[PDB]
Design an enzyme around this catalytic site. Structure first.
Site: not given
Length: 345
Positions: A46-48, A50-51, A190, A194-195, A208
């Protein structure tokens, strides 16, 4: 260096210029959340980030109400720095501590025993609000009464052009989700469209979703002090004094509403975050009314943007305000959906 942004307040000094947040590592993991890894089949990403990444999945026997259930699965990269592994368990502990709510992305279970840590959460069919508002921009017609039967359709998967009623529904739902987090003394830090994800039934869920994003490729974050900050969403006291509270969350909520009623526009259009941006915010600069905001809605944004944090409205009161901007039937539908959610499983 991956951590969940959310913090839960444990105490405030009597002044109180000092907040103490719970150390999530100090909380318990209720092993009743544990779910057999072979009950879980992973699918599309669904989304990738950095971690790690968030992956679509199917859980079998996780839920009594839906024995075959679509889920989203949060996981780290194999490289897996150890502090990060703890961070993920901490997120797990915080979600267990908060408990469930209709308008957040809920914890459904976890795989923590033999293999990589998995957090299993609700799956949100329509994805995040930014992309959703973008994709439905051209179809938007303005036109708010129960009798129309427009109101009944709103909290359903039925297909029609996007309407002011939809935007108000999203507004109300984010307020109720944030009223819930605030009632737990949880500070989001945050909050942004987008969240906010959109699930089946057009139910908005706050989360988040940072794990599924590369902060370094995301222009919405600005580098500070070895960290990147969502500056255009941040209250002045968070920018300048490093103070994050429910009241600075309320400021972000106002920015979020601007995102909503501009159909996914970027805040402070044409204004880059730089020295003259900080000075303007400090000097009282606020955005003008977006094209699709009503006067009542912009008035809400303006209230959230009070320079004095304690003069900003509470999420409880914001919920009441927005409720009155909506047809009576809509609150009726929301109540039924609220009850159905709590009865689930």
């Amino acid at each position: 260096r991956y951590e969940i942004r959310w913090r839960v307040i444990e105490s405030i000094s009597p002044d109180g210029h000092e907040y103490i947040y719970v150390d999530p590592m100090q909380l318990p993991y209720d092993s009743r959340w544990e779910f057999p890894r072979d009950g879980l089949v992973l699918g599309r990403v669904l989304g990738s980030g950095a971690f790690g990444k968030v992956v679509e999945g199917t859980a079998y026997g996780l839920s009594r109400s839906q024995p075959v259930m679509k889920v989203a699965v949060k996981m780290l990269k194999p490289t897996a720095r150890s502090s990060e592994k703890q961070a993920l368990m901490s997120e797990l502990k915080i979600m267990t501590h908060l408990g469930p709510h209709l308008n957040i992305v809920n914890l459904l279970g976890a795989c923590t025993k033999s293999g990589p840590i998995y957090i299993i959460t609700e799956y949100c069919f329509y994805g995040d609000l930014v992309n959703y508002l973008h994709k439905n921009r051209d179809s938007f017609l303005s036109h708010s009464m129960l009798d129309s039967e427009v109101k009944n359709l709103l909290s359903d998967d039925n297909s029609e052009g996007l309407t002011l009623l939809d935007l108000l529904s999203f507004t109300y739902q984010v307020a109720r989700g944030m009223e819930f987090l605030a009632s737990k003394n949880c500070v989001h830090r945050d909050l942004a469209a987008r969240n906010v994800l959109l699930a089946q039934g057009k139910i908005v869920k706050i989360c988040d979703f940072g794990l599924a994003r590369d902060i370094m490729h995301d222009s919405n974050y600005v580098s500070k002090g070895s960290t990147f900050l969502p500056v255009k969403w941040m209250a002045p006291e968070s920018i300048f004094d490093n103070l994050y509270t429910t009241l600075s969350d309320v400021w972000s909520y106002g920015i979020l509403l601007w995102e909503i009623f501009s159909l996914g526009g970027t805040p402070y259009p044409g204004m880059m975050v730089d020295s003259t941006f900080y000075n303007k915010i400090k000097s009282g600069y606020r955005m003008a009314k977006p094209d699709h905001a009503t006067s009542e809605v912009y008035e809400i944004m303006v209230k959230c943007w009070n320079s004095e944090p304690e003069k900003r409205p509470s999420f409880y009161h914001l919920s009441e305000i927005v409720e009155n901007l909506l047809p009576g039937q809509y609150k009726k539908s929301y109540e039924k959906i609220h009850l159905d959610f709590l009865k689930s499983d």
